[PDB]
Amino acid sequence: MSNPYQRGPNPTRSALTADGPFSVKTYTISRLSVSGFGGGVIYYPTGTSLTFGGIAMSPGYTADASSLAWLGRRLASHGFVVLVINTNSRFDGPDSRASQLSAALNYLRTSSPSAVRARLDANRLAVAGHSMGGGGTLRIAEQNPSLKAAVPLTPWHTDKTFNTSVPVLIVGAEADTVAPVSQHAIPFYQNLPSTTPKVYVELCNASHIAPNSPNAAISVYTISWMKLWVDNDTRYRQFLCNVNDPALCDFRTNNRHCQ
Q: Which residues bind Ca ion (CB under 5 A)?
A: 31, 159, 161
Q: Which is nearer to Na ion, 173 or 226 (CB)?
A: 226
Taking the complex as a whole, how short is the minimal distance between the CB of residue 110 and Na ion, in angstroms?
A: 12
25 touches, from Na ion, Ca ion, none (C-beta below 5 to 8 Å by class): none
Helices 69-77, 216-230: axis angle to 10 degrees equals 50
102 touches, from Na ion, Ca ion, none (C-beta below 5 to 8 Å by class): Na ion
User: DSSP for 191-223?
Assistant: HS-TTS-EEEEEETT--TTGGGS--HHHHHHHH
Catalytic positions are 131, 176, 208
Q: Coil, strand, or helix at residue 62?
A: coil
User: DSSP for 18-32?
Assistant: S--SSEEEEEEE-GG
Instruction: List the helix and strand counts (H, then E) for the chain.
Output: 6, 9
Taking the complex as a whole, how short is the minimal distance between the CB of residue 48 and Na ion, in angstroms?
A: 27
Taking the complex as a whole, how short is the minimal distance between the CB of residue 56 and Ca ion, in angstroms?
A: 15
> Which candidate, 54, 60, 28, 31, places its Cα nearest to that of 42?
28
144 makes contact with Na ion (CB under 5 A): yes
Q: Which residues pair with 128 in a beta bridge?
A: 57, 151
156 labeled binding residue? yes
Q: Which is nearer to Ca ion, 92 or 233 (CB)?
A: 92
226 labeled binding residue? no
Taking the complex as a whole, how short is the minimal distance between the CB of residue 160 and Ca ion, in angstroms?
A: 7
Q: State which of positions 160-199 bind Na ion (CB under 5 A).
A: none
Count CA atoms within 13 Å of residue 198 on its CB side. 23
132 labeled binding residue? yes
The residues that touch Na ion, with contacts defined as CB under 5 A, are: 102, 144
Which residues are known binding-site members for poly(ethylene terephthalate)?
Answer: 61, 132, 156
